[PDB]
Amino acid sequence: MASEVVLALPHKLRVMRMYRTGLKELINWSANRHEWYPRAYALRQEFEDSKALTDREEI
């Protein structure tokens, strides 16, 4: 779970900061940027599987 300030972020901004911090952590767990590239591509793709979601409960 995020912090209370992040809880106050707009849905768009909340998801944006989520993805940004996820990339940051993947760098943090990465051995190298070179290792981070395919992880970055996969992380981008995973969000792409959720682009067309409408039901706010499942979102």
């Binding site: 809880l7 106050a8 972020l9 707009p10 849905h11 909340r14 409408t54 039901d55 706010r56 409960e57």
Partner: protein, 464 residues
């Protein structure tokens, strides 16, 4: 044995498969607007009438101590004139579409709806949006309704069952938001004004908490267009002020307690005993529905009460313990209530109390399979009867989108009901009933009602 009069039917309770009834049941379409408001329709193929309205995830729970009673006062004020239509203009326009407007305000849910014909869908949408968004909230009408509410409060003008249930909610949910009455105290009515009504509607009547549900003869795309034109201007909701954050911030608490409201020269003796039940999202809520069907209900205008399937109905009808009774299963967002309410007099109140307690505790130990099959069939048949009236279809659409988050299909509901057996009933009764605290409420001639220790002792058996 009669050949034609004795086939096809027998009194042995057997499970019935309701699967072929699912082939022709209609489908629900849901569209979410950018406002956050969901538009959900269910088209019945040859319907001539339409029920449509606005269901709101708000009510008396989400008020404060200072403005308790604002949501109930809102349905007194809202139909008294808008900024675009007067009282007579609204009356004429509603009369010409041949329907009636109606409103209910619960502890957690509010609806304003219209039962019209199929040709008056857009007019009903426009009228409902006009009262909801552009109301006058005139101070003269507020003063004209305050005195009437104060007179009916001074007269104690209330139903007996509503009086008992309000006492029950007040003593079972002490120091939590669910213990307040919908009506509110006398002082808040004596000091109500237009500002509190405006602030309540501005805070709580927002996009993610509102469902526009229509059933009967209605097209989904046209209702989407009409709702985007009319209800498109409702404010969105902050993430910090959602319904879940308010539920977390002020949670429900159950306290085992006792209250009676004694009157010096009353005739009846109404009483309710409830246990802490399940919330709406608990998967044990379906067995509680089956158990409530197993307990049933009865009133003395029926004469076949001695041939009932339910043992509690049989006991009360045969021995004449009560004039009427009913088992209830109330579900809220984070708690619930399960129990029996009945009307008796002072000489039969203890025996009725014993019958209630003995039949509640008996479900933990001995449950036969015939009763469970009978109650499952009766509950599925009761669910099919609600599908016959478009008002109940629209009410169920609004309620299910507000409190489950989704429209539960009929196949899933039948499958969840059919998964209940006698072991599940024994387990759920053991979880909720056995050796637990209960809440007791009574009103009227209640000098012979047993105290709390008598009720607490009879929640368990010393012989097993």
């Amino acid at each position: 044995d009669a050949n034609p009069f004795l086939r096809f039917s027998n009194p042995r309770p057997s499970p019935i498969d309701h699967t072929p009834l699912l082939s022709t049941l209609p489908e629900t379409r849901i569209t979410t607007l950018p406002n956050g408001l969901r538009v959900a329709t269910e088209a019945i193929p040859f319907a001539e009438t339409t029920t449509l309205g606005i269901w709101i995830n708000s009510g008396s729970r989400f008020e404060t101590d200072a403005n308790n009673g604002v949501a109930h006062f809102l349905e007194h004020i809202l139909f008294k004139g808008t900024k675009n239509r007067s009282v007579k203009e609204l009356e004429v326009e509603v009369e010409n579409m041949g329907g009636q407007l109606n409103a209910y305000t619960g502890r957690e849910q509010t609806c304003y709806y219209a039962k019209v014909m199929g040709k008056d869908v857009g007019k009903a949408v426009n009228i409902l949006s006009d009262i909801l968004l552009n109301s006058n909230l005139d101070a003269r009408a507020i003063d004209k309704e305050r005195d009437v509410i104060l007179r009916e409060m001074e007269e104690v003008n209330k139903q007996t069952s509503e009086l008992v249930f309000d006492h029950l909610h007040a003593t079972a949910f002490q120091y939590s938001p669910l213990g307040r009455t919908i009506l509110g105290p006398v002082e808040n009515i004596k000091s109500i004004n237009r500002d509190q009504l405006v602030e309540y509607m501005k805070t709580h009547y927002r996009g993610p908490r509102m469902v526009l549900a229509a059933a009967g003869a209605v097209n989904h795309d046209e209702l989407v267009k009409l709702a985007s034109d009319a209800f498109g201007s409702v404010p969105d909701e902050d993430a910090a002020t959602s319904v879940r954050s308010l539920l977390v911030k002020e949670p429900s608490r159950f306290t085992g307690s006792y209250v009676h409201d004694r009157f010096p020269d009353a005739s009846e003796c109404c009483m309710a005993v409830a246990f802490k039940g399940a919330s709406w999202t608990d998967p044990d809520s379906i067995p509680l529905m089956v158990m409530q069907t197993m307990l049933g209900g009865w009133d003395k205008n029926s004469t076949v009460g001695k041939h009932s399937s339910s043992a509690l109905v049989q006991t009360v009808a045969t021995e004449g313990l009560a004039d009427a009774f009913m088992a209830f299963n109330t579900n809220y967002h984070d708690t619930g209530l399960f129990g029996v309410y009945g009307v008796t007099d002072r000489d039969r109140s203890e025996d009725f109390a014993y019958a209630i307690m003995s039949n509640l505790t008996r479900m933990c130990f001995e449950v036969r399979d015939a009763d469970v099959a009978r109650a499952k069939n009766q509950l599925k048949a009761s669910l099919m009867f609600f599908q016959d009236s478009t008002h109940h279809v629209a009410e169920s659409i609004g309620r299910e989108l507000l409190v489950y988050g989704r429209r539960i299909p009929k196949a899933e509901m039948f499958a969840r009901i059919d998964a209940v057996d006698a072991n599940a009933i024994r387990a759920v009764a053991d979880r909720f009933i056995y050796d637990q605290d209960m809440a007791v409420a009574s009103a009227g001639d209640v000098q012979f009602v047993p105290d709390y220790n008598w009720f607490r002792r009879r929640s368990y058996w010393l012989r097993y």
